[PDB]
Design a binder for these strands. Structure first.
Ligand SMILES: [Mg+2]
Ligand SMILES: [Mg+2]
Ligand SMILES: [Mg+2]
Ligand SMILES: [Mg+2]
Ligand SMILES: [Mg+2]
Ligand SMILES: [Mg+2]
Ligand SMILES: [Mg+2]
Ligand SMILES: [Mg+2]
Ligand SMILES: [Mg+2]
Ligand SMILES: [Mg+2]
Ligand SMILES: [Mg+2]
Lengths: 31, 50, 153, 107, 63
RNA sequence: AGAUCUUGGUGGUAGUAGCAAAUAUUCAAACGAGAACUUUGAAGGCCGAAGUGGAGAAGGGUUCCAUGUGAACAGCAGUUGA
Protein backbone atom coordinates (compact mmCIF):
# COMPACT_ATOMS: atom_id res chain seq x y z
CA UNK A 1 0.00 0.00 0.00
CA UNK A 2 1.10 3.59 -0.60
CA UNK A 3 2.62 5.82 2.07
CA UNK A 4 4.27 9.23 2.38
CA UNK A 5 7.82 8.07 1.63
CA UNK A 6 6.53 5.80 -1.13
CA UNK A 7 4.83 8.74 -2.85
CA UNK A 8 7.82 11.01 -2.19
CA UNK A 9 10.09 8.65 -4.10
CA UNK A 10 7.34 7.94 -6.65
CA UNK A 11 7.30 11.61 -7.64
CA UNK A 12 10.99 11.43 -8.55
CA UNK A 13 10.61 8.01 -10.17
CA UNK A 14 7.74 9.07 -12.45
CA UNK A 15 9.18 12.20 -14.09
CA UNK A 16 11.62 11.34 -16.87
CA UNK A 17 11.86 14.86 -18.25
CA UNK A 18 10.78 18.45 -17.92
CA UNK A 19 7.55 20.25 -18.69
CA UNK A 20 5.77 18.85 -21.72
CA UNK A 21 7.10 15.29 -21.46
CA UNK A 22 5.03 12.17 -20.86
CA UNK A 23 5.21 10.76 -17.35
CA UNK A 24 6.54 7.24 -16.92
CA UNK A 25 3.70 4.74 -16.61
CA UNK A 26 5.20 1.53 -15.24
CA UNK A 27 8.45 -0.21 -14.37
CA UNK A 28 8.64 -3.94 -13.62
CA UNK A 29 11.42 -6.42 -12.89
CA UNK A 30 10.25 -9.91 -13.89
CA UNK A 31 11.79 -13.29 -14.67
CA UNK B 1 25.92 -4.58 -58.22
CA UNK B 2 23.07 -6.65 -56.88
CA UNK B 3 22.47 -7.96 -60.40
CA UNK B 4 25.48 -10.09 -61.25
CA UNK B 5 26.27 -13.04 -63.47
CA UNK B 6 27.35 -16.46 -62.24
CA UNK B 7 30.91 -16.06 -63.55
CA UNK B 8 31.32 -12.71 -61.82
CA UNK B 9 29.94 -14.14 -58.59
CA UNK B 10 32.31 -17.10 -58.75
CA UNK B 11 35.30 -14.84 -59.42
CA UNK B 12 34.37 -12.68 -56.43
CA UNK B 13 33.93 -15.82 -54.34
CA UNK B 14 37.45 -17.01 -55.13
CA UNK B 15 38.89 -13.58 -54.35
CA UNK B 16 37.05 -13.47 -51.03
CA UNK B 17 38.22 -16.97 -50.11
CA UNK B 18 41.86 -16.29 -50.90
CA UNK B 19 41.89 -12.94 -49.05
CA UNK B 20 42.67 -14.24 -45.57
CA UNK B 21 45.73 -14.32 -43.28
CA UNK B 22 48.22 -17.17 -43.24
CA UNK B 23 47.68 -19.91 -40.64
CA UNK B 24 49.81 -19.48 -37.56
CA UNK B 25 51.53 -22.87 -37.80
CA UNK B 26 53.04 -22.04 -41.20
CA UNK B 27 55.64 -19.89 -39.45
CA UNK B 28 56.83 -22.97 -37.53
CA UNK B 29 57.74 -24.98 -40.64
CA UNK B 30 61.34 -25.85 -41.46
CA UNK B 31 62.84 -23.21 -43.74
CA UNK B 32 59.61 -21.24 -43.77
CA UNK B 33 60.76 -17.71 -44.71
CA UNK B 34 57.18 -16.35 -44.83
CA UNK B 35 56.16 -13.70 -42.31
CA UNK B 36 52.68 -12.64 -43.44
CA UNK B 37 50.38 -12.76 -46.45
CA UNK B 38 51.72 -10.11 -48.81
CA UNK B 39 48.77 -10.61 -51.19
CA UNK B 40 46.13 -9.26 -48.80
CA UNK B 41 43.59 -7.02 -50.50
CA UNK B 42 41.31 -4.40 -48.97
CA UNK B 43 38.16 -3.45 -50.83
CA UNK B 44 38.77 0.27 -50.36
CA UNK B 45 42.53 0.39 -50.96
CA UNK B 46 42.88 -1.67 -54.15
CA UNK B 47 40.04 -2.47 -56.53
CA UNK B 48 39.80 -5.75 -58.39
CA UNK B 49 40.78 -5.50 -62.03
CA UNK B 50 37.30 -6.71 -62.91
CA UNK C 1 71.39 -3.63 -22.51
CA UNK C 2 73.94 -1.08 -23.75
CA UNK C 3 73.26 2.26 -22.11
CA UNK C 4 75.40 5.24 -22.88
CA UNK C 5 77.15 6.56 -19.77
CA UNK C 6 77.15 3.48 -17.58
CA UNK C 7 76.91 4.47 -13.89
CA UNK C 8 80.08 4.87 -11.87
CA UNK C 9 78.76 2.38 -9.29
CA UNK C 10 75.94 0.07 -10.45
CA UNK C 11 74.83 -0.84 -6.93
CA UNK C 12 73.45 2.58 -6.02
CA UNK C 13 71.90 2.98 -9.47
CA UNK C 14 68.69 2.05 -11.27
CA UNK C 15 67.90 2.23 -14.96
CA UNK C 16 64.84 2.77 -17.13
CA UNK C 17 64.43 2.51 -20.88
CA UNK C 18 61.80 2.87 -23.57
CA UNK C 19 61.93 2.37 -27.31
CA UNK C 20 59.86 3.66 -30.23
CA UNK C 21 57.70 5.82 -27.98
CA UNK C 22 55.08 7.88 -29.82
CA UNK C 23 56.04 11.30 -28.50
CA UNK C 24 57.71 14.15 -30.31
CA UNK C 25 61.48 13.96 -30.11
CA UNK C 26 62.06 17.70 -29.80
CA UNK C 27 59.53 18.22 -27.02
CA UNK C 28 60.83 15.17 -25.18
CA UNK C 29 64.44 16.33 -25.52
CA UNK C 30 63.57 19.69 -24.01
CA UNK C 31 61.63 18.06 -21.17
CA UNK C 32 64.51 15.67 -20.47
CA UNK C 33 67.02 18.52 -20.36
CA UNK C 34 64.72 20.34 -17.95
CA UNK C 35 64.37 17.43 -15.52
CA UNK C 36 68.01 16.36 -15.82
CA UNK C 37 69.85 16.46 -12.51
CA UNK C 38 66.69 16.82 -10.45
CA UNK C 39 65.76 14.82 -7.41
CA UNK C 40 63.16 12.20 -8.25
CA UNK C 41 60.50 13.83 -6.06
CA UNK C 42 61.28 17.24 -7.53
CA UNK C 43 61.12 15.80 -11.05
CA UNK C 44 57.76 14.16 -10.36
CA UNK C 45 56.33 17.39 -8.97
CA UNK C 46 57.74 19.40 -11.86
CA UNK C 47 56.36 17.06 -14.51
CA UNK C 48 52.94 17.16 -12.87
CA UNK C 49 53.16 20.96 -12.81
CA UNK C 50 54.07 20.96 -16.50
CA UNK C 51 50.98 18.84 -17.13
CA UNK C 52 48.90 21.32 -15.11
CA UNK C 53 50.56 24.32 -16.84
CA UNK C 54 51.97 25.67 -13.58
CA UNK C 55 55.63 25.24 -14.56
CA UNK C 56 57.04 25.19 -18.08
CA UNK C 57 59.88 23.48 -19.87
CA UNK C 58 62.21 25.96 -21.60
CA UNK C 59 62.68 25.27 -25.29
CA UNK C 60 66.36 26.01 -25.80
CA UNK C 61 67.53 24.23 -28.96
CA UNK C 62 64.31 23.36 -30.80
CA UNK C 63 62.66 26.73 -30.30
CA UNK C 64 61.83 27.85 -33.83
CA UNK C 65 58.48 29.57 -33.55
CA UNK C 66 57.96 28.60 -29.90
CA UNK C 67 56.16 31.39 -28.10
CA UNK C 68 57.11 33.22 -24.95
CA UNK C 69 55.76 32.72 -21.46
CA UNK C 70 56.13 34.17 -17.99
CA UNK C 71 57.11 30.85 -16.42
CA UNK C 72 60.22 30.68 -18.62
CA UNK C 73 61.91 33.26 -16.37
CA UNK C 74 62.61 30.76 -13.59
CA UNK C 75 64.79 29.12 -16.17
CA UNK C 76 67.31 31.57 -17.48
CA UNK C 77 65.37 31.81 -20.68
CA UNK C 78 62.42 33.30 -22.57
CA UNK C 79 60.63 30.58 -24.58
CA UNK C 80 58.74 27.82 -22.82
CA UNK C 81 55.94 25.35 -23.37
CA UNK C 82 54.02 22.57 -21.61
CA UNK C 83 54.45 19.31 -23.51
CA UNK C 84 51.79 17.19 -21.88
CA UNK C 85 52.55 13.96 -23.73
CA UNK C 86 56.29 14.24 -23.08
CA UNK C 87 55.62 14.94 -19.41
CA UNK C 88 53.34 11.90 -19.16
CA UNK C 89 55.84 9.61 -20.86
CA UNK C 90 58.65 10.82 -18.62
CA UNK C 91 56.44 10.35 -15.56
CA UNK C 92 55.76 6.76 -16.59
CA UNK C 93 59.46 6.12 -17.14
CA UNK C 94 60.21 7.67 -13.75
CA UNK C 95 57.70 5.35 -12.09
CA UNK C 96 59.34 2.40 -13.85
CA UNK C 97 62.77 3.53 -12.64
CA UNK C 98 61.47 3.92 -9.09
CA UNK C 99 60.04 0.40 -9.21
CA UNK C 100 63.39 -0.91 -10.44
CA UNK C 101 65.11 0.89 -7.57
CA UNK C 102 62.72 -0.69 -5.09
CA UNK C 103 63.41 -4.11 -6.60
CA UNK C 104 67.17 -3.52 -6.28
CA UNK C 105 66.60 -2.51 -2.66
CA UNK C 106 67.94 1.05 -2.62
CA UNK C 107 65.70 3.70 -1.10
CA UNK C 108 63.94 6.01 -3.53
CA UNK C 109 63.90 9.16 -1.39
CA UNK C 110 67.53 9.87 -2.37
CA UNK C 111 67.37 9.13 -6.09
CA UNK C 112 68.64 11.82 -8.47
CA UNK C 113 68.39 11.75 -12.26
CA UNK C 114 72.05 11.65 -13.19
CA UNK C 115 71.60 10.48 -16.78
CA UNK C 116 68.78 11.07 -19.23
CA UNK C 117 68.96 10.75 -22.99
CA UNK C 118 66.45 11.01 -25.84
CA UNK C 119 67.42 9.43 -29.18
CA UNK C 120 65.53 9.58 -32.45
CA UNK C 121 63.61 6.43 -33.38
CA UNK C 122 62.78 5.15 -36.88
CA UNK C 123 60.14 7.36 -38.44
CA UNK C 124 56.63 6.05 -39.04
CA UNK C 125 55.25 6.93 -42.46
CA UNK C 126 51.86 8.43 -43.16
CA UNK C 127 50.42 10.31 -46.11
CA UNK C 128 49.10 13.79 -46.82
CA UNK C 129 47.34 15.08 -49.92
CA UNK C 130 48.26 18.39 -51.51
CA UNK C 131 47.00 20.84 -54.08
CA UNK C 132 47.71 19.53 -57.52
CA UNK C 133 47.46 15.78 -57.15
CA UNK C 134 50.57 15.54 -55.00
CA UNK C 135 51.47 13.27 -52.10
CA UNK C 136 53.73 14.38 -49.28
CA UNK C 137 55.05 12.64 -46.17
CA UNK C 138 53.28 12.99 -42.85
CA UNK C 139 55.93 11.24 -40.81
CA UNK C 140 56.05 10.72 -37.07
CA UNK C 141 59.22 11.35 -35.06
CA UNK C 142 59.26 8.89 -32.16
CA UNK C 143 62.08 8.61 -29.65
CA UNK C 144 64.00 6.17 -27.52
CA UNK C 145 64.47 7.36 -23.94
CA UNK C 146 66.92 6.09 -21.36
CA UNK C 147 67.63 7.25 -17.84
CA UNK C 148 69.90 6.32 -14.95
CA UNK C 149 69.15 7.42 -11.39
CA UNK C 150 71.65 7.35 -8.53
CA UNK C 151 71.63 7.88 -4.79
CA UNK C 152 73.34 10.97 -3.43
CA UNK C 153 72.61 12.86 -0.21
CA UNK D 1 31.67 22.88 9.22
CA UNK D 2 32.60 21.67 5.74
CA UNK D 3 29.22 20.26 4.62
CA UNK D 4 27.67 23.71 4.39
CA UNK D 5 25.00 24.69 1.88
CA UNK D 6 24.48 28.33 0.90
CA UNK D 7 22.33 30.28 -1.55
CA UNK D 8 23.82 32.77 -3.99
CA UNK D 9 22.74 34.82 -6.97
CA UNK D 10 25.13 35.11 -9.91
CA UNK D 11 25.23 38.06 -12.30
CA UNK D 12 25.44 35.95 -15.43
CA UNK D 13 25.04 39.14 -17.48
CA UNK D 14 28.12 40.64 -15.84
CA UNK D 15 30.16 37.46 -16.25
CA UNK D 16 29.06 36.82 -19.85
CA UNK D 17 29.30 40.37 -21.22
CA UNK D 18 31.21 40.59 -24.49
CA UNK D 19 31.02 36.90 -25.42
CA UNK D 20 29.86 36.01 -28.92
CA UNK D 21 26.45 34.59 -29.64
CA UNK D 22 27.36 30.93 -30.07
CA UNK D 23 29.55 30.90 -26.95
CA UNK D 24 27.31 32.63 -24.40
CA UNK D 25 25.44 29.72 -22.83
CA UNK D 26 28.54 27.44 -22.66
CA UNK D 27 30.59 30.18 -21.07
CA UNK D 28 27.77 30.88 -18.63
CA UNK D 29 28.22 27.36 -17.26
CA UNK D 30 31.99 27.74 -17.30
CA UNK D 31 31.56 30.91 -15.22
CA UNK D 32 29.13 29.14 -12.89
CA UNK D 33 31.75 26.44 -12.39
CA UNK D 34 34.41 29.09 -11.72
CA UNK D 35 32.09 30.85 -9.26
CA UNK D 36 31.43 27.63 -7.36
CA UNK D 37 35.14 26.73 -7.31
CA UNK D 38 36.12 30.17 -6.02
CA UNK D 39 33.37 30.40 -3.42
CA UNK D 40 33.48 26.85 -2.02
CA UNK D 41 37.16 26.06 -2.65
CA UNK D 42 36.49 22.71 -4.34
CA UNK D 43 37.89 21.90 -7.81
CA UNK D 44 35.21 19.19 -8.08
CA UNK D 45 31.99 21.01 -8.96
CA UNK D 46 28.95 19.22 -10.34
CA UNK D 47 26.11 21.18 -11.93
CA UNK D 48 22.56 19.89 -11.60
CA UNK D 49 20.87 19.07 -14.88
CA UNK D 50 17.98 21.35 -13.91
CA UNK D 51 20.46 24.20 -13.47
CA UNK D 52 21.98 23.46 -16.88
CA UNK D 53 18.47 23.51 -18.35
CA UNK D 54 17.71 26.81 -16.61
CA UNK D 55 20.86 28.39 -18.06
CA UNK D 56 19.95 27.04 -21.51
CA UNK D 57 16.25 27.92 -21.13
CA UNK D 58 16.26 30.87 -23.55
CA UNK D 59 18.65 29.49 -26.16
CA UNK D 60 22.37 29.79 -26.66
CA UNK D 61 22.73 33.58 -26.89
CA UNK D 62 19.94 35.07 -24.75
CA UNK D 63 21.16 33.71 -21.43
CA UNK D 64 19.32 34.93 -18.30
CA UNK D 65 20.92 38.00 -16.75
CA UNK D 66 20.80 36.65 -13.19
CA UNK D 67 20.56 33.15 -11.79
CA UNK D 68 19.75 31.96 -8.27
CA UNK D 69 21.84 28.94 -7.32
CA UNK D 70 22.48 26.85 -4.23
CA UNK D 71 26.03 25.68 -3.54
CA UNK D 72 26.09 22.56 -1.35
CA UNK D 73 29.55 21.38 -0.35
CA UNK D 74 29.41 17.64 0.29
CA UNK D 75 31.83 14.92 1.30
CA UNK D 76 33.02 12.97 -1.74
CA UNK D 77 32.86 9.64 0.07
CA UNK D 78 31.71 7.92 -3.13
CA UNK D 79 35.30 7.01 -4.05
CA UNK D 80 38.96 7.62 -3.19
CA UNK D 81 39.58 10.52 -5.54
CA UNK D 82 42.11 13.23 -4.63
CA UNK D 83 39.15 15.58 -4.13
CA UNK D 84 37.50 14.43 -0.91
CA UNK D 85 34.98 17.30 -1.15
CA UNK D 86 32.75 18.27 -4.05
CA UNK D 87 30.24 21.06 -4.62
CA UNK D 88 26.81 20.34 -6.06
CA UNK D 89 25.20 23.47 -7.49
CA UNK D 90 21.44 23.44 -7.97
CA UNK D 91 18.90 25.81 -9.49
CA UNK D 92 16.61 27.82 -7.21
CA UNK D 93 13.62 29.27 -9.11
CA UNK D 94 12.70 32.77 -7.99
CA UNK D 95 10.13 35.39 -8.94
CA UNK D 96 12.29 38.47 -8.32
CA UNK D 97 15.96 39.23 -7.75
CA UNK D 98 15.53 42.42 -5.73
CA UNK D 99 16.94 42.45 -2.19
CA UNK D 100 18.29 38.89 -2.35
CA UNK D 101 21.38 38.35 -0.21
CA UNK D 102 23.72 35.41 0.19
CA UNK D 103 21.99 33.36 2.89
CA UNK D 104 22.95 30.17 4.68
CA UNK D 105 20.29 27.47 4.52
CA UNK D 106 19.66 24.52 6.83
CA UNK D 107 18.81 20.96 5.76
CA UNK E 1 27.97 -0.22 -21.66
CA UNK E 2 26.98 0.69 -25.22
CA UNK E 3 23.35 0.37 -26.34
CA UNK E 4 23.64 1.13 -30.05
CA UNK E 5 22.22 -2.27 -31.01
CA UNK E 6 19.38 -2.12 -28.48
CA UNK E 7 18.13 1.25 -29.71
CA UNK E 8 18.19 -0.01 -33.30
CA UNK E 9 16.20 -3.11 -32.35
CA UNK E 10 13.72 -1.17 -30.23
CA UNK E 11 13.05 1.17 -33.15
CA UNK E 12 12.14 -1.77 -35.38
CA UNK E 13 9.99 -3.46 -32.74
CA UNK E 14 8.20 -0.24 -31.78
CA UNK E 15 7.87 0.64 -35.50
CA UNK E 16 9.00 4.20 -34.75
CA UNK E 17 12.21 6.15 -35.21
CA UNK E 18 15.28 6.14 -33.03
CA UNK E 19 14.21 9.64 -31.97
CA UNK E 20 11.29 8.18 -30.04
CA UNK E 21 13.05 5.21 -28.41
CA UNK E 22 13.58 5.85 -24.70
CA UNK E 23 16.04 3.52 -22.99
CA UNK E 24 16.01 3.70 -19.19
CA UNK E 25 19.25 5.49 -18.25
CA UNK E 26 19.29 3.78 -14.85
CA UNK E 27 18.72 0.20 -16.04
CA UNK E 28 21.55 0.32 -18.57
CA UNK E 29 22.96 -3.04 -17.47
CA UNK E 30 19.64 -4.85 -17.92
CA UNK E 31 18.98 -3.45 -21.40
CA UNK E 32 22.51 -4.36 -22.51
CA UNK E 33 21.65 -8.05 -22.04
CA UNK E 34 18.82 -7.77 -24.59
CA UNK E 35 20.54 -8.98 -27.76
CA UNK E 36 17.37 -10.22 -29.48
CA UNK E 37 14.10 -8.68 -30.62
CA UNK E 38 12.25 -11.07 -28.32
CA UNK E 39 14.18 -9.65 -25.36
CA UNK E 40 13.35 -6.13 -26.55
CA UNK E 41 9.63 -6.94 -26.56
CA UNK E 42 9.94 -8.15 -22.97
CA UNK E 43 11.67 -4.93 -21.92
CA UNK E 44 9.02 -2.88 -23.74
CA UNK E 45 6.34 -4.75 -21.81
CA UNK E 46 8.20 -4.18 -18.53
CA UNK E 47 8.59 -0.44 -19.06
CA UNK E 48 12.36 -0.26 -19.54
CA UNK E 49 11.89 0.77 -23.19
CA UNK E 50 9.33 3.46 -23.96
CA UNK E 51 8.07 5.13 -27.13
CA UNK E 52 8.25 8.86 -26.51
CA UNK E 53 5.22 10.81 -27.78
CA UNK E 54 5.24 12.84 -30.97
CA UNK E 55 6.56 16.38 -30.59
CA UNK E 56 3.64 18.78 -30.34
CA UNK E 57 3.01 20.74 -33.54
CA UNK E 58 -0.25 22.49 -32.74
CA UNK E 59 -2.54 23.91 -35.41
CA UNK E 60 -4.44 26.14 -32.98
CA UNK E 61 -2.60 29.25 -34.17
CA UNK E 62 -3.48 28.53 -37.80
CA UNK E 63 -7.09 27.81 -36.86
C1' A F 1 82.90 16.04 -56.58
C1' G F 2 80.30 17.58 -60.36
C1' A F 3 76.83 15.31 -65.66
C1' U F 4 69.03 20.13 -63.68
C1' C F 5 73.72 12.42 -63.34
C1' U F 6 71.12 6.86 -61.45
C1' U F 7 69.47 4.32 -56.91
C1' G F 8 69.15 4.52 -51.63
C1' G F 9 69.44 7.24 -47.20
C1' U F 10 69.60 11.88 -44.25
C1' G F 11 69.44 17.26 -42.83
C1' G F 12 68.26 22.81 -42.35
C1' U F 13 63.70 24.74 -43.27
C1' A F 14 60.68 23.22 -38.54
C1' G F 15 57.85 21.66 -33.82
C1' U F 16 57.21 25.91 -38.86
C1' A F 17 52.98 26.38 -42.72
C1' G F 18 49.04 24.35 -41.34
C1' C F 19 44.60 20.75 -38.98
C1' A F 20 39.34 28.23 -40.66
C1' A F 21 33.41 26.23 -46.86
C1' A F 22 28.15 24.54 -45.39
C1' U F 23 25.03 28.67 -37.55
C1' A F 24 26.21 24.67 -32.10
C1' U F 25 26.78 22.95 -28.50
C1' U F 26 25.80 21.91 -22.83
C1' C F 27 24.78 19.13 -18.17
C1' A F 28 24.69 14.38 -15.50
C1' A F 29 25.64 9.20 -15.49
C1' A F 30 27.56 4.24 -17.18
C1' C F 31 31.64 1.37 -19.01
C1' G F 32 36.67 2.00 -18.73
C1' A F 33 43.66 2.46 -16.47
C1' G F 34 42.30 6.57 -19.35
C1' A F 35 36.37 10.43 -21.98
C1' A F 36 35.82 17.43 -25.61
C1' C F 37 34.90 13.09 -29.36
C1' U F 38 31.84 6.19 -27.02
C1' U F 39 26.82 4.99 -24.95
C1' U F 40 22.32 6.41 -22.23
C1' G F 41 19.19 10.37 -20.26
C1' A F 42 18.00 15.73 -20.10
C1' A F 43 18.28 20.32 -22.73
C1' G F 44 19.57 23.80 -27.06
C1' G F 45 19.85 23.67 -32.22
C1' C F 46 20.23 22.15 -37.64
C1' C F 47 18.49 19.37 -42.35
C1' G F 48 12.86 21.32 -43.21
C1' A F 49 9.49 16.39 -47.73
C1' A F 50 13.35 19.77 -54.74
C1' G F 51 15.85 16.67 -46.88
C1' U F 52 21.39 15.89 -43.68
C1' G F 53 14.50 11.32 -44.56
C1' G F 54 12.90 6.19 -46.85
C1' A F 55 14.22 2.92 -51.14
C1' G F 56 16.57 1.45 -56.05
C1' A F 57 19.81 1.41 -61.24
C1' A F 58 25.31 1.66 -62.61
C1' G F 59 29.60 0.75 -59.87
C1' G F 60 31.88 -1.64 -55.48
C1' G F 61 32.40 -6.85 -53.61
C1' U F 62 31.53 -8.76 -48.11
C1' U F 63 32.17 -2.98 -46.91
C1' C F 64 26.28 -6.35 -44.40
C1' C F 65 25.52 -8.73 -38.92
C1' A F 66 27.23 -10.26 -34.01
C1' U F 67 31.48 -10.89 -30.59
C1' G F 68 36.43 -9.56 -29.33
C1' U F 69 41.29 -6.51 -29.76
C1' G F 70 43.47 -1.83 -29.03
C1' A F 71 49.73 -2.96 -32.63
C1' A F 72 49.19 -0.11 -37.18
C1' C F 73 45.05 2.91 -39.88
C1' A F 74 40.58 6.55 -39.23
C1' G F 75 46.15 13.83 -40.81
C1' C F 76 43.44 15.47 -32.43
C1' A F 77 41.65 11.53 -29.68
C1' G F 78 38.68 7.20 -29.15
C1' U F 79 36.35 2.64 -24.60
C1' U F 80 34.37 3.98 -31.46
C1' G F 81 34.89 2.27 -36.64
C1' A F 82 33.47 0.97 -43.61
MG1 LIG G 1 37.39 4.56 -54.65
MG1 LIG H 1 61.16 31.47 -37.78
MG1 LIG I 1 45.48 18.82 -48.48
MG1 LIG J 1 43.50 14.30 -57.53
MG1 LIG K 1 79.55 10.97 -55.31
MG1 LIG L 1 50.99 26.99 -36.08
MG1 LIG M 1 44.27 27.61 -39.08
MG1 LIG N 1 15.09 24.91 -39.46
MG1 LIG O 1 18.44 8.74 -49.38
MG1 LIG P 1 28.94 -2.37 -39.61
MG1 LIG Q 1 44.87 10.06 -35.26
Amino acid sequence: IMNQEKLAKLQAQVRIGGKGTARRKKKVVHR
Amino acid sequence: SSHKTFRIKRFLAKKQKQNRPIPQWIRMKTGNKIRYNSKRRHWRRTKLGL
Amino acid sequence: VRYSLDPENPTKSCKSRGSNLRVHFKNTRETAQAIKGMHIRKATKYLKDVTLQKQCVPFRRYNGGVGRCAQAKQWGWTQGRWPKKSAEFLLHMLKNAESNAELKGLDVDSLVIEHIQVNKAPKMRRRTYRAHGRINPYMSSPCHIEMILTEKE
Amino acid sequence: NEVVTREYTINIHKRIHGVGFKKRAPRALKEIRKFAMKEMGTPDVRIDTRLNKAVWAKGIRNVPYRIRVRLSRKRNEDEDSPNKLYTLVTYVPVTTFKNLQTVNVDE
Amino acid sequence: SMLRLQKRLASSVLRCGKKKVWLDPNETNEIANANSRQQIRKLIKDGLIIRKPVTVHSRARCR
